[PDB]
């Protein structure tokens, strides 16, 4: 299901049309209090997700240099 | 700089308006072969990024059982 990374921001793991997706995304809250996906986000497949993970060290380095 | 996680997909680390952004995003290629940012992406601040990292194990567990 869902993994929160900020107010109104979630990583979601779902099966969509047979295929697994790691989705990093902004959400709105509707009037019934339900979270609904906003248009600012990205769906990654597991290989892309893997590549992201593999580069965390490099990403962190760049972030630290600021 | 930039970090590739698939065809047409890059994580970008930049300083924007005083603050650091880890930006995970889809790119188009223009006719001169240059990559340009598409609208499907998300800019994460370091706190959000931290929360993402903290939950990698849990995200992976979700993905694995699928």
UniProtKB/Swiss-Prot annotation, chains A, B:
Protein modification: Activity is controlled by protein kinases that target the regulatory region. Phosphorylation inactivates both ds DNA-binding and cofactor function, but does not affect binding to ssDNA. Seems to be phosphorylated in vivo by CK2 in at least 7 sites in the N-terminal Ser-rich region.
Example GO molecular function: RNA binding
Keyword Transmembrane helix listed: no
Subunit text: Homodimer. Interacts with CSTF2.
The organism's place on the tree of life at top rank: Eukaryota
UniProtKB keywords: Acetylation, Activator, DNA-binding, Isopeptide bond, Nucleus, Phosphoprotein, Transcription, Transcription regulation, Ubl conjugation
Result for mutant: residue 25 to G: Loss of ssDNA binding
Part of the whole protein covered: 63 to 127 of 127
Main location: nucleus
Modified residue annotations for N6-acetyllysine: 7
One record GO biological process: regulation of transcription by RNA polymerase II
Glycyl lysine isopeptide (Lys-Gly) (interchain with G-Cter in SUMO2) crosslink site(s): 7
The UniProt record lists the keyword Nucleus: yes
Covalent cross-link site, Glycyl lysine isopeptide (Lys-Gly) (interchain with G-Cter in SUMO1): 7
Job of this protein: General coactivator that functions cooperatively with TAFs and mediates functional interactions between upstream activators and the general transcriptional machinery. May be involved in stabilizing the multiprotein transcription complex. Binds single-stranded DNA. Also binds, in vitro, non-specifically to double-stranded DNA (ds DNA).
One of the record's GO cellular component terms: extracellular exosome
Region (Interaction with ssDNA): 16-40
Positions carrying Phosphoserine: 57
Entry's family note: Belongs to the transcriptional coactivator PC4 family.
Full protein name: Activated RNA polymerase II transcriptional coactivator p15
Localization per record: Nucleus
């Amino acid at each position: 299901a869902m993994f929160q990374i900020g107010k109104m921001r979630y990583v979601s793991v779902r099966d969509f049309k047979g295929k697994v997706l790691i989705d990093i995304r902004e959400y709105w809250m509707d009037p019934e209090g339900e979270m609904k996906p906003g248009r600012k986000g990205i769906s990654l497949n597991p290989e892309q997700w893997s590549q992201l993970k593999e580069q965390i060290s490099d990403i962190d380095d760049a972030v630290r240099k600021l």
